[PDB]
Amino acid sequence: MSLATVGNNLDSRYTMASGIRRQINKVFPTHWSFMLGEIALYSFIVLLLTGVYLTLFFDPSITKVIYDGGYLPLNGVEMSRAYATALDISFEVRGGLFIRQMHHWAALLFVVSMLVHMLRIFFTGAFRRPREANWIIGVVLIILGMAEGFMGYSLPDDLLSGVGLRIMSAIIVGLPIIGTWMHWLIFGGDFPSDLMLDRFYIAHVLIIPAILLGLIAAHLALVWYQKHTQFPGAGRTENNVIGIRIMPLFAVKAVAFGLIVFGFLALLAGVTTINAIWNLGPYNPSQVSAGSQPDVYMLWTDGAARVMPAWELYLGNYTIPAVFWVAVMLGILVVLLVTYPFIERKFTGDDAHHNLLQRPRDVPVRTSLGVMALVFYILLTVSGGNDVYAMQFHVSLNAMTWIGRIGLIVGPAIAYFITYRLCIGLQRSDREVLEHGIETGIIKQMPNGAFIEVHQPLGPVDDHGHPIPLPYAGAAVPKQMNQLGYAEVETRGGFFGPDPEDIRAKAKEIEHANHIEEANTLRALNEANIERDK
Amino acid sequence: MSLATVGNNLDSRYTMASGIRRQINKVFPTHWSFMLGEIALYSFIVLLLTGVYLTLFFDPSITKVIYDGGYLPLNGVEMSRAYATALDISFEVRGGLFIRQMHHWAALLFVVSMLVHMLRIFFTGAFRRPREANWIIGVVLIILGMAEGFMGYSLPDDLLSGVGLRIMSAIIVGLPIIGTWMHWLIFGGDFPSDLMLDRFYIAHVLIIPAILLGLIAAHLALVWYQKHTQFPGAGRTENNVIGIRIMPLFAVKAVAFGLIVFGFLALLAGVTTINAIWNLGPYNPSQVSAGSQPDVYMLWTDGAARVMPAWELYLGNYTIPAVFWVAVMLGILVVLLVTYPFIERKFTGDDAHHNLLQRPRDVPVRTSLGVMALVFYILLTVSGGNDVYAMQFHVSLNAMTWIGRIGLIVGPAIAYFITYRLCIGLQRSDREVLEHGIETGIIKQMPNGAFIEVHQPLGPVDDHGHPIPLPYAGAAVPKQMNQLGYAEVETRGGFFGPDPEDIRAKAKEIEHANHIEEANTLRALNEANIERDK
Ligand code: HEM
Ligand code: HEM
Ligand code: HEM
Ligand code: HEM
C-alpha cells in the first residue's frame, strides 16, 4: 500500500525513525488517579473551541442600545451592547444558547478538575523532588484559571456580573497606598468605565488563555520528560515504570476518555440551565438581589469577606478599611499553597529523589493537614453561599455568619484530629492483615468448644502452624478473600445459557494458566529487584 | 559563587546537562543572507507586544457616538465607536500615537522582511529537498501575514479602511454559486453589519496571531532540527556545517540585531507619520477619495482588479461578474508559488538531498523566472498605485492602465531575456578568472612593444609560464587584488599618530601568522574532504 511510500518519504527527509520509536515505547502507569489531570486538559480544549465560537457574536462594549432582538420580554429596555449581544447569542443564533451553556459548564468542570487533580498530587506526595516545579507551575494555573473564569462571567454586563465587578473595584480602591492609583490604572477611571469591558474582554480571550496554554504546554512537557510516578507494588522500584506503552493501548484510552468527557459536557450543557442571564436584566449600580454570589470557584473569597469582623483603622488623614485584612488572609492562604513543598522539606527533614508515591494513610500529618485545608476551604465556600443556605435550610443568617467565623477556627482542629486517628487506624488494619492473614469470616467450633476463625495466610507459615509476619511495603494489602480470586465465576457463557463444555473447559484452563504466568513474571521481577539492590 | 548551587539544583532534578550542551554547541553559518528571516521574526515580536498595548484602548464596535474627545476638529461629528477609540489612542493617551505608528510600521517591515527572506530562499535554492516543507509552511505564513494586516488596518472604521472593506464584500458576493451565501456567513448580513467589526477584531487579535505564532514556532523548530544550509566554500561539504556556535558568538549577535531592528522601528515610528486617520473622517458608504488604495502589501491584488478588461458573462437568469477572473488569476498566482518545488522537480529531473546552496548566477532559469515574477508583481503593485503615479509624474491615467495591461505580458519576457543573459555573463567572468587568473590592471610594455597585463594566478602554473585552469566549484571566485589582501594597511595605530614601532611590528607579525594558520587549516580540511570522498 502507498502508506509505506508516505512513511518512506517522510523519514528520508526528517529521519524521525529513531525518535518516534522512542516516543511510542514510553510507558505510563494505569492507576485511576492518573487521568484526573486529563479531565482538566480536555475541559480546557473545550473551553478554547466553544469560546472561539462565542466570539463571532459577542460585542464587548459598555455603550448602550435600545434592545429590539428576539427576546421579546426586554424589547425597548436600554441595555449595554455586551448584554444585547449575549442575548442575541442566546436567542437569535441557532444553538448559541447550547454553546454558551457548554462554555460555562466546561469552565466549572475545568476548575473542579484542577482542584481534584491537585488534591491527588498533594495527598499522594507527587509534588516531592524533582517534581516540585510542576507544583509551582500548577498552582499558578489553578489561580489564573479562576482569575480568567471570574472575568469570563463578568463580560455580559448583566445585573449579577456587575455586582461582582463592583466588589472587585471597591476592594482595589481600598488598598493602603496605591489603591486609588491601581484602580485608575486598571479600569481607566472610575467604575463603570468606558474602557473596562474591552480590557477585560481582551484579558479573557487573548492574554490569560495564551498564558494558560503556554504553562499547560510546559506542564505536560515536564511530566513527559521526567516520567510519571507510580504507587508501590509488585516489581516496582524507584528506577523503573510499570504500565502500558503510550500506544496502542494508552493513546486509544486517552482518546476514549476525551470522548467521554466531551460528550458528558455536551449532555449537561443542553439538559441543565446555567447563568440564565435573560431574567437578570442589565446592570445598573442601584440594584441588587438577595442571592448575588459570584461563581462557585470564587465563593471562598466571598466567604472571607463575609466572616471578617469589621476591624478598621483610622490614622488622622488616612484609613485602612476593614477589607484589607481579607486581602492579607487570602494572600497568606495562597502563599502557603504556593510554597508548600519547601515548608514540607524544612519539617520533614529530607531532600531525597522520590519516584514512588505515598499512600495517604501512611503520611498522616500531610493528609490531616490536607483535610484541614479542605474543611477550611469548604467553610469559606458555604459561608460565601450562606444567604442561599439560610433561606433554604432555615438556619438564621446571623447564626450562619457566626458558624463560619467560629468554624474556621474550630472545625479545622476537629478535622485534623479525626483524620489523623483514622489514618492510623487504617494502617493498623494493614499491619493486622500482614501479621495474621486475611480473616475469611469462616467460623468453626473446635472439639473443645473454642470458636476459631480460619485465617488465610499470605506469606509462609511457621512449623507451629501460624503465619510469619511480612514487612509492610507501602503497596495495598488485600483484606478479603474475594480479592484473591476465590469468588470468581466457574461457569462461562452469556445470559440465558452456557457455552459448550469443551470451549468452557479449554477457556478456563487458559485463563488459569495466564493467571499463574503473570504471578510468576511479577515474582521473578521482584526477586531481580532484590538481587540488583543487594 | 551561588550560581553553581543554582545550576546544581537544576540539573540534579532535570538532568539537562547532556541536552543543553548539545544545544549550545550547534553550529550556524554566518552569511549576511542568513539573518533576513530574523528581521521578520523580530518584527513579529514587536507586532505582538505593541498590539497588546493597543487593545487596552481600542473598542471594536460599529455603533455610533457623538465625538467629544481631545481632537477638537471632530467634536460633534457622529462616528463609530471604533473610530472614536482609535482617535482617543491617537490624542487622549500619552504616547498612544507613537505606539500606533510603531505597530503599523512593524507590520510593513514584517511583510517586506518575509518577502525578501522568501526571495533569498527562492534564488539560493534552499527550498529543495528535504526543506520543501519549510517552503509550504512559509508561503502560508506570508499569505496569512497579509490577510491579517489587511484586516488590521480595516478595524478603525475610517473612510480609507471602509472602502477596502466594501471592496472585499463586493468581491465575495460576486462568486458564481455561493457568493451571497458566503458573504452572509462571513459578515452576518449585508454590509456594513453589526457583527462585522467584532468578527474582524477577534480574527485580527486572536485567531490569525495564534496561527502565525504556531506556524512560526514549527518553522523555526524545523530549521533548527535539520541544520541550516550553506554556500559552497573552502572545506564545506554536503555533510557538515561551518560557522559559529549558537553561543557565545551567535546568540549575542542575534540579540544585537534584535536591538538594531527594535530601535530602528522605534525611530521611524516617531519620525514618519503613517495612516493619519484623524483627517480621513469616519466611514460612510457614499464618500470616496481619489487616492484610496489599500495597504502596500495589498496593492498587487488591487492592481489585478485595475487591469482586468471587463469580461463579464450573462447566462439567462445568472451572471458571472467581471471580477471573478481576477480571483482566478490571483489564485493561480498563489498556487504557483505554493507548489513551486514540485514543478521544479518535474522539469529539473532530480530528487537529490541537497545541503549546499546554489549561487543564483549558476541557475539562470530559476533566477530568470524569479526576476520575471518580480517584474510581474511590481507591475501589479504600481498599477495598483497608478492613481498616485499619474497624478505625480504626469502620465495619463489611461496610459497607466494600458501600461499595466500590456506590460504584464511584455515586461516579464524582457526581464527573463535580460536576466538569463546577465547570469550567463556573470558565470563566464567567473570561468575567465579561474582559467586565466585575476587581471591586476598593471599593464607593462615588453621590449617588442607588446602591451601585456600581468595576471596573478590562483592555482599552479605550467612550465610554459601560464596558469593551469581550476575546476569551478560554486564558491565565489575573487576578481580583484584588493580581495586577496594586497591593499591592506601596513601602518598600525589610531588617528593623529602611530603605535610605537615594537608594538607595531609584533602585532603585524601575529596578524600574518594567523592569516597563514587559517589558510592552512582550511586547506587541510579540504584535503580531508577529498580523502573522505575518494
Ligand atoms: C489545567 C491545569 C492542569 C493540567 C492540564 C494538568 C495536567 C496534568 C496531567 C495530564 C498529568 C499526568 C496525568 C495525571 O497525573 O493524572 C499531570 C501530572 C502532574 N500534575 Fe498536573 N495538571 C494541571 C494542574 C496541576 C496543578 C494545579 C498541580 C499542583 C498544584 C499540578 C501538578 C502536577 C504534578 C506535580 C504532576 C506530576 C506528578 C506525577 O508525575 O506523578 N498540575 N498534570
Ligand atoms: C480561547 C479562549 C476563550 C475565549 C475566546 C472565550 C470567549 C468567551 C466570551 C466571548 C465570553 C462572553 C460571551 C458569552 O457570554 O457567551 C465568555 C464567557 C465565559 N468564559 Fe470564556 N473564553 C475563553 C476561555 C475561557 C476559559 C479558559 C474559561 C475558564 C477558566 C472561561 C470561562 C468563561 C465563563 C465562565 C464565561 C461566562 C459564560 C456565560 O456567562 O454564559 N473562558 N468566554
Ligand atoms: C514570518 C515568517 C518567517 C519567519 C519568522 C522565518 C524565519 C526563518 C529563520 C530565522 C530562518 C533561518 C535564518 C535565515 O534563513 O535567515 C529561516 C529559514 C528558512 N525559511 Fe523562513 N521565515 C519566515 C517565512 C518564510 C517564507 C515566506 C519562506 C518561503 C516561502 C520560508 C522558508 C524558509 C526555509 C526553507 C528556510 C530554511 C532554509 C535553509 O536552511 O537554508 N520562511 N526562516
Ligand atoms: C497579538 C497580536 C495583535 C494584536 C493584539 C493587535 C492589535 C491591533 C489593534 C487593536 C489594532 C487597531 C487599533 C489601532 O488602530 O491602534 C491593530 C491595528 C493594526 N494591526 Fe494589529 N495586532 C496584532 C497583530 C498584528 C499583526 C501580526 C499585524 C501584521 C501582519 C498587524 C497589523 C496591523 C495594522 C497594519 C494595523 C493598523 C494600524 C493603524 O491603522 O494604526 N497586527 N492591531
Percent helix, strand and coil across chain A, each to the nearest 5: 65, 5, 30
From the list B321, B93, B134, B123, the residue with the least C-alpha distance to B227 is: B134
Q: Which of residues 127-156 of B touch A (CB under 8 A)?
A: 129-130, 133
**Coarse DSSP helix, strand, coil percentages of chain B, rounded to the nearest 5 percent:** 65, 5, 30
Residue B87 CB neighbours (<10 A): 22
Find, among A129, A98, A143, A152, the residue nearest to A352 by Cα.
Answer: A129
Q: Which residues in B444-477 are b (16+ Cβ under 10 Å) and which e?
A: eeeeeeeeeeeeeebeeeeeeeebeebeeebeeb
Dihedral (Cα; B491, B496, B501, B504), 10-degree rounding: -40
* Euclidean distance between CA atoms A100 and A502, whole angstroms: 58
In a domain, A481, yes or no: no
Four-residue CA torsion sign, B149, B152, B156, B161? positive
A202 Cβ under 8 Å from any chain B Cβ: yes
Give the β-pairing of B313-315 and A78-80: unpaired
**Beta strand ranges found along B421-464 (DSSP E):** 438-445, 451-456, 461-462
> Position of cell 473569597?
A301
Nearest CB neighbour to A199, from listed B56, B133, B199: B56
Residue A38 Cα: closest atom of ligand 1: 10
- Say which amino acid occupies B162: G
Pairwise CA distance, residues A9 & A15, whole Å: 10
Determine the residue of A155, A273, A275, A298 to mutate for testing ligand 2's pocket, defined as the one with the most ligand atoms within 8 A of the Cβ atom.
A155
Resolution (A): 3.1
Asked if A198 has any chain B CB less than 8 Å from its own CB, the reply is: yes
**Which single residue is written with the C-alpha cell 485463563?**
A511
Q: Are A27 and A227 in contact (CB under 8 A)?
A: yes
CA of A104 to the centre of ligand 2 (A): 7
DSSP B122-160: HHHTTTSTTTHHHHHHHHHHHHHHHHHHHHHHHTT-BHH
- Residues 110-129 in B contacting A (C-alpha not used; CB under 8 Å): 129
The CA distance from B294 to B305, in Å, is 12
At residue B454, the 3 state secondary structure works out as strand
Q: Is the dihedral of CA A474, A476, A477, A479 positive or negative?
A: positive
Map residue B238 onto helix, strand or coil.
coil
CB B61 within 8 A of CB B82: yes
* DSSP state, residue B519: H
* DSSP codes, A81-100: HHHHHHHHHHHTSTTHHHHH
Strand partners, A80: A64
Query: How many Å lie between the centroid of ligand 4 and the Cα of residue B205?
Result: 7
Which 3-state string (H, E, C) describes A255-321?
HHHHHHHHHHHHHHHHHCCCCCHHHCCECCCCCCCCCCCCCHHHHHHHHHHHHCCCCCEEECCEEEC
Contact A82, A59 (CB under 8 A): yes
C-alpha cell at A170: 471597591
- Chain B neighbors of A58, CB-CB under 8 A: 198
Which residue of B13, B48, B67 is the best one to mutate when testing the A interface, meaning the one whose CB has the most A CBs within 10 A?
B13
Q: DSSP string spanning A10-40?
A: HHHHH-THHHHHHHHT-EE---SGGGHHHHH
| Residue A452 in domain | no
Please check whether residue B149 is in contact with residue B107, taking contact to mean a CB–CB distance below 8 angstroms: yes
Query: Count of alpha carbons within 13 Å of B383, Cβ hemisphere only?
Result: 25
Instruction: Give the separation between CA A356 and CA A350, rounded to whole angstroms.
Output: 15
Which cell numbers in the block locate residue B234?
573552502
Could you identify the residue written with the cell 522568501? B118
In a domain, A17, yes or no: yes
Does any domain span residue B67?
yes
Residue A189 DSSP class? S
**Residue burial A208-217, b: 16+ Cβ < 10 Å; e: rest:** bbbebeeebe
Q: How many domains would you assign to chain A?
A: 1
Q: Where are the beta strands (DSSP E) in A55-189?
A: 64-66, 78-80
Q: For residue B48, give the ligand 4 atom closest to its CA.
A: 1
Contact state of B202 with A56 under an 8 Å Cβ cutoff: yes
CA distance B128 to B159: 45
Q: Which of A52, A81, A202 sits opposite B63 (nearest CB)?
A: A81
Q: Is A31 annotated as a binding residue?
A: no
B189: helix, strand or coil: coil
- Other beta carbons within 10 angstroms of residue B307's beta carbon come to 23
Cβ–ligand 2 contact at A416 (below 6 Å): no
What is the rounded CA–CA span in Å between residue A390 and residue A395?
A: 5
Q: Does residue B410 belong to any structural domain of this protein?
A: yes
Burial class for B295, CB neighbours closer than 10 Å (0-12, 13-18, 19+): buried
Q: Give the angle subtended at the CA of A176 by the CAs of A174 and A180, to the nearest 5°.
A: 55
Q: Grid coordinates in use for B520?
A: 592552512
Kindly state the DSSP code that residue A74 receives in the 8-state scheme. Answer: G
Task: With both helix axes pointing from N to C terminus, report the angle between A132-154 and A340-348 in degrees, rounded to the nearest 10.
Answer: 150
* Alpha-carbon gap, residue B446 to B437, rounded angstroms: 20
Does the CB of B59 have a partner CB in chain A at under 8 Å?
yes
Residue ranges of B 425-444 with Cβ closer than 8 A to chain A = none
- Distant-in-sequence, close-in-space partners of A207: CB < 8 Å, separation ≥ 6: B52
CA trace torsion A336, A338, A341, A344 (10° rounding) = 0
**Which residue in B378, B152, B391, B175 sits closest to B292, CA to CA?**
B391
Is the omega angle on the peptide bond into residue A360 within 30 degrees of 0, that is, cis? no
Q: Are B155 and B60 in contact (CB under 8 A)?
A: yes
Is B443 strand, coil or helix? strand
Query: Is some CB atom of chain B closer than 8 A to the CB atom of A261?
Result: no
Taking the CA of residue B249 and the nearest CA in chain A, the distance in Å comes to 28
Method used to obtain the model = cryo-EM
Q: CB within 6 Å of ligand 3 — which residues? A: B 34-38, 40-41, 44, 114, 117-118, 121, 126-127, 131, 134-135, 138-139, 141-142, 216, 219, 223, 228-229
Question: B212 CA distance to ligand 2 centroid (A)?
Answer: 23
Give A132's contacts (C-beta < 8 A, 6+ positions apart).
A341, A342
DSSP run (H or E) holding B466: strand B466-467
Helix (H, G, I), strand (E, B) or coil at B29: coil
CA atoms within 13 A of residue A171's CA, in its CB half-sphere: 17
CATH number, domain of B90, equals: 1.20.810.10
Query: How far apart, in whole angstroms, are the C-alpha atoms of residue A436 and residue A432?
Result: 6
* Interface membership of A93 toward B (CB under 8 Å): no
Q: Does residue B479 sit within a domain?
A: no
Residue with cell 471632530: B74
What pairs with residue A78 in β-bridges? A66
Asked whether the CA dihedral B432, B436, B441, B446 is positive or negative, the reply is negative
CB A225, CB B14: distance < 8 Å:
yes
Give the span between the Cα atoms of B111 and B146, in whole angstroms.
7
Query: What are the chain A neighbours of B207 within 8 Å (beta carbons)?
Result: 52
CA dihedral sign of residues A9, A14, A20, A21: positive
A509, part of any domain? no
Q: Please answer whether residues A337 and A132 qualify as being in contact, where contact means their C-beta atoms are separated by less than 8 angstroms.
A: no
Flag whether B270 is in a domain: yes
Ligand 3 center–CA B134 separation, angstroms: 7
Q: Are A129 and A52 in contact (CB under 8 A)?
A: no
Domain containing B401: what range?
A: 2-424
Residue A470 burial by CB count (10 A; 0-12/13-18/19+): exposed, middle or buried?
middle
Distance from the A213 Cα atom to the nearest Cα atom in chain B, whole angstroms: 11
Cell 504556593: give the residue: A338
Q: Which residues of B are annotated as a binding site for heme?
A: 103, 117, 204, 219
Question: Other C-beta atoms within 10 Å of A199: how many?
Answer: 19
For A495, residues 6+ apart whose C-beta sits below 8 A from its C-beta are none
- Let me know: does B368 contact B414? Beta carbons within 8 Å: no
Cβ distance B135 to B341 under 8 Å?
A: yes
Asked if B206's CB is within 8 angstroms of A55's CB, the reply is yes
- Answer yes or no: are the C-beta atoms of B30 and B244 closer than 8 Å: yes
- What is the β-pairing status of strands B244-245 and B64-66? unpaired
Calculate the CA dihedral of residues B273, B274, B278, B283 and round it to 10 degrees: 170
Q: Does B396 touch chain A (CB under 8 A)?
A: no
**Would you call B199 and A56 a contact, using CB atoms and an 8 Å cutoff?**
yes
List the grid coordinates of B195. Answer: 457583527
Nine cell digits for residue A20: 518516534
Apex A380 CA angle, A378 and A382, nearest 5: 65
> How many angstroms is it from A327 CA to the middle of ligand 2?
26
In this structure, chain B runs to a length of: 534
- What's the DSSP call for residue A450? -
Phi/psi zone of residue B446: left (φ > 0), alpha (ψ -120 to 50 degrees), beta? Answer: beta
